[PDB]
Amino acid sequence: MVTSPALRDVHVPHAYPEQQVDLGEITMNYAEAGDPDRPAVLLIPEQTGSWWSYEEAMGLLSEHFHVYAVDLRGQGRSSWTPKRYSLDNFGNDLVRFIALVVKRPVVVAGNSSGGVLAAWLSAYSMPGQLRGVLCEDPPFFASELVPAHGHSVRQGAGPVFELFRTYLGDQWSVGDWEGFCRAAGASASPMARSFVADGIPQHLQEYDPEWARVFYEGTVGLSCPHERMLGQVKTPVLLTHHMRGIDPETGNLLGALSDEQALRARRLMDSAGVTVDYESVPDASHMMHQSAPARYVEIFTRWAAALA
Amino acid sequence: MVTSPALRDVHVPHAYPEQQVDLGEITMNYAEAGDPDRPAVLLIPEQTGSWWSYEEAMGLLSEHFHVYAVDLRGQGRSSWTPKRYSLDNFGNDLVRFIALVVKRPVVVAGNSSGGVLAAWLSAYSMPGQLRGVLCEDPPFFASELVPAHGHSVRQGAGPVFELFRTYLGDQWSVGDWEGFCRAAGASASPMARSFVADGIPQHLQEYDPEWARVFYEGTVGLSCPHERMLGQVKTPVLLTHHMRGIDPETGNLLGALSDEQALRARRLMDSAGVTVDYESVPDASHMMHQSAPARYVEIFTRWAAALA
Amino acid sequence: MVTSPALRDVHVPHAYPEQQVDLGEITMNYAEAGDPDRPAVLLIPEQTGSWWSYEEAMGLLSEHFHVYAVDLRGQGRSSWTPKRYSLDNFGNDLVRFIALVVKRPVVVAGNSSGGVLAAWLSAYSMPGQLRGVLCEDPPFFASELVPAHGHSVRQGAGPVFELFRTYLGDQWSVGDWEGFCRAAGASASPMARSFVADGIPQHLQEYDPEWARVFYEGTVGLSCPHERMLGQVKTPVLLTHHMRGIDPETGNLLGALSDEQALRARRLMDSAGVTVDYESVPDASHMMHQSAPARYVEIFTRWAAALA
Amino acid sequence: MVTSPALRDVHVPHAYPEQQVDLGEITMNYAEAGDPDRPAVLLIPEQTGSWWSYEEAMGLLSEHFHVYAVDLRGQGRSSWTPKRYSLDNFGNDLVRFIALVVKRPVVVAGNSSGGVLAAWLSAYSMPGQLRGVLCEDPPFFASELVPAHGHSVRQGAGPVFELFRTYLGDQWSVGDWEGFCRAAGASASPMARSFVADGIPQHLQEYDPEWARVFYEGTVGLSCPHERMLGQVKTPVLLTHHMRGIDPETGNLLGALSDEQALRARRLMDSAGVTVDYESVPDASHMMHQSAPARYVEIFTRWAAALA
């Protein structure tokens, strides 16, 4: 057997056993850590990341919390659903996971697009499902094609998403890794180059690149403008803001969101009447939970421990 | 006080008392009829219709069923949500209503767009929520801007939706009823002229015309192609097909869906592995549950009684 | 030197010498045949076809006409212009070619998309530039994403355009010919399979597949609805209608346009006040000028000879 | 007779007589000033402006130049063309006007969208038609829905265009001036409030508000990205940059383009190899040719005199 991303037979073992749940349209794959009597935490990966993006952080959080880490649809061992990728479908999948698996109020932490989905749940979950959310370096506004504030996706991560769409393809239908690496290495985007490797990185083998299409094309959030979601949050919010800057050659955003976009997000969430904490860590990498797990967990724990 | 659709102070009493539930993002208004110990039924109105579209049919269905009739978001007394109107948000609202209010498996019946939503639930609800669905004159394919089969919305109901968008406006921000009636009276679409009246009909006063925009502009179902939904239904389906035809002047569809679209929908649901029933009533009006309630209830009851 | 479509060094000699003209934004490549004192004819190829699609027909037409055959932008040796492909840019290129090279009124004949452009010139050229147009098997309506009448591109040639977009790519940026042939051979579209070959056909090597993208995505004609263009033609029109049918498995259109779309196009052009000739040749292939050159030239000549 | 913008019977006399030319698809209305033997100048108004936007500046320019001022399609007495409004159609109209009416090389000056069109001609006219262009406060990038650099239209003039689309409507099909003024008066955009008046201003009565739609919806320039146009200019360019700033409440752009967008435009034109002049007049109103005609003409003349 020659395995392939398109055939979805690429998965490998990890430090925690995996479980699956039927949510109706999809099956969600996930893993669990910690004492089930301790407060529940739901971890949402960044785009291209599976649940095991949190593997090291899970071991540290297990000191105090009952942790669930999930594969979103289009990722990992969860269902791939051509033509169905939207913030509302990702979000409602997570509402169902809470109702069907967790069965208790949760603290949610999500990285990047996962942090956009953490804010989505704060605003749009079923009543009483959430105690608070941590949005770890989220591209508020900057992941939209037509944002209310600041740089668009085409002026931020879009160059990478375009390469994923063109060289990898929906459901890995093209799979031209050599052409991806050629184009990426010649790109003006540093982030594009960070995926260049001899072989396809494991997390990307598990990723449905239709995700990149719906971000690039502005369809993933067409029915979910960020200004309305942010102004309707209903729980405490912790917003962590990592490296960010401007590329001189193009004017494009480096990092997840600009200082302007973070300010506007903070004002909107304040107007919603919730408690907002903002932690600027301008020296931290995008996936702090992976590059500096102890630092991430200390931030999360100090904040979560004071919730309820 | 001069009431106005834009101010949402236009509602009037009906034959059943009204109840409200917080679903999280929205509050949903609904009414209930019948003995709660009898099998549960959920009624979904047509576009521009409130729960009381079913008032007469509810009284007859109360003989054998426990009936819930709902206002969708953007209609009636349920929340209006600018920029959030999509099949997935309407559908997940209904999933939450079943989980939080009904708390038992349901038979779903929906008219027109409501029948599109009934099929949505058959495919995409949470597991075990549904016993079967009735799709009463549903615009499968014909309500999509880019359908896989047959006439597009622009070749069907689009002329009416365009007039709602232009003369009534999102959240009734324009409210030019006189201009609507002038334009509708000169239209080639009989359906358009069917809304012309001296005053605004009560049901339309309760309707958020952003609904019409998202149908006309192809955004309401952008992340929910009908061919994928219909191929993923998981319950028995009854499809009723009322008046339909072709306007010789324009070639446009008259009615909810063509024979070709009904055939393609039936084949897709058959390939999903469910029991499909098809009842053609070519002399029936679009809202049979309103114009011929006894006939509608006989069809529904005969089919529902044979379910489980 | 290893030549490549993306490097645009693939061209070969043909039976006529080639010439180039600066039209401003682009350089147009073309070839000329016949006695320059005889009536001028401009030949527009089908999509993926270069000027030499007409090579055999040119020799026959030279008996009576002064023939120019052109490469459109994105084709052949004419400029490739990323992000600029639209009916209005193709059309205005041709207006400039007439004004700068031909310098006399012309009879225009175009195949498929070239026939759409022949109708465009009939409606939208500069005054007095045209004596008449032949639209050879044109996808009126059927090449639009949202047509006023009949099947959309997604229900016609779209499956082929999708494969060109995904496996060949804008400006041949992907160039996965093996993957194209694999996907095409498994396609339900007979036309997709007609491009399958051991090596890339010469005409396709010269083609910028961004053309297929703008057709598939509905941008090429977004500012040029066919119902308005057809109702504004200003010259005699000959419309030839070749093989057409319906695929039983999918309901999709086979051929360039349906009988319904041809009828509606004929009515619109009649309403414009012009002379319309309609030649149904239901046994002819799509590129009659190439598969049956003598038959094509006899049709063109009988009609052109009676113009002016 | 009760005149109405929708009926296009609202025009009035001006200080110069008006002339019309058939350009093919459209008829273009224009006025002429000065000695025909002097160097030719073509004046392009701002959006919502007719040729007589330049009436005072024409009288001063007549001292040294032969001046043509035009109504674009969708404005003034030139044809209204539903569904056809795009930069490429406006631009090719102007190419035809130069070829059919002026018949000599021209210096072009255009305000706002007209300055976008002046750059369009510099890049895309027929060869030899232009000696140079002046772009008077042009919304480079800022009038695009998805620009390569800086604020989008939704973050700039979009609020005004949205009000034109909703309360005036395509071809003045809604015509709700009272509702426009109510909405415009409550808007955050000063530019919106600048159109509020007891009666409809004369220039707006001549304007087809479908213009506003195609700017707001991102279709007018979909096939004409500004970064490609600006990188392909072929004549000297003068860019005047008037009042601009940031609204602290919203973050939105005030004025035609930001400093960042002006810089990126200058660099692109420099890379095209032309002479670029940039005149910042940060105290000037948007239509300097109207509010300070003598200053506008001094800038234009000083620069034009140094051309050829």
Residue numbers in the entry:
A (entry chain A), B (entry chain B), C (entry chain A), D (entry chain B): 1 to 308
Excerpt from the paper describing this PDB structure:
Zearalenone (ZEN) is a mycoestrogenic polyketide produced by Fusarium graminearum and other phytopathogenic members of the genus Fusarium. ZenA cleaves zearalenone [ZEN, (S,E)-14,16-dihydroxy-3-methyl-3,4,5,6,9,10-hexahydro-1H-benzo[c]oxacyclotetradecine-1,7(8H)-dione] to hydrolyzed zearalenone [HZEN, (S,E)-2,4-dihydroxy-6-(10-hydroxy-6-oxoundec-1-en-1-yl)benzoic acid], which decarboxylates spontaneously to decarboxylated hydrolyzed zearalenone [DHZEN, (S,E)-1-(3,5-dihydroxyphenyl)-10-hydroxyundec-1-en-6-one]. Furthermore, we report site-directed mutagenesis as well as structural analysis of the dimeric ZenARe of R. erythropolis and the more thermostable, tetrameric ZenAScfl of Streptomyces coelicoflavus with and without bound ligands. The X-ray crystal structures not only revealed canonical features of α/β hydrolases with a cap domain including a Ser-His-Asp catalytic triad but also unusual features including an uncommon oxyanion hole motif and a peripheral, short antiparallel β-sheet involved in tetramer interactions.
The ZenAScfl tetramer is a dimer of dimers, and its subunits display canonical features of the α/β hydrolase fold. The core domain features a central β-sheet made of eight strands, which are parallel except for strand β2, which is inverted. This twisted β-sheet is sandwiched between two α-helices (A and F) on the front side and four α-helices (B, C, D, and E) on the back side. ZenAScfl features a cap domain inserted between sheet β6 and helix αD, composed of four α-helices. Notably, ZenAScfl features a β-sheet formed by two short, antiparallel strands linked by a tight turn between β-strand 7 and α-helix E, which protrudes from the α/β hydrolase core and touches the left side of the cap domain. We nicknamed this peculiar β-sheet, the “flake”. The catalytic triad of ZenAScfl is located in negatively charged cavities opposite the dimer interface and is composed of Ser-112, Asp-137, and His-286. The structure of ZenAScfl confirmed conserved His-286 in the loop between β-strand 8 and α-helix F as the catalytic histidine, at a distance of 2.9 Å between NE2 and OG of Ser-112. The crystal structure showed Asp-137 OD2 positioned at a distance of 2.7 Å from ND1 of the catalytic His-286. The backbone amides NH of Ser-113 and Gln-47 are in positions that suggest their functional role as hydrogen bond donors of the oxyanion hole of ZenAScfl.
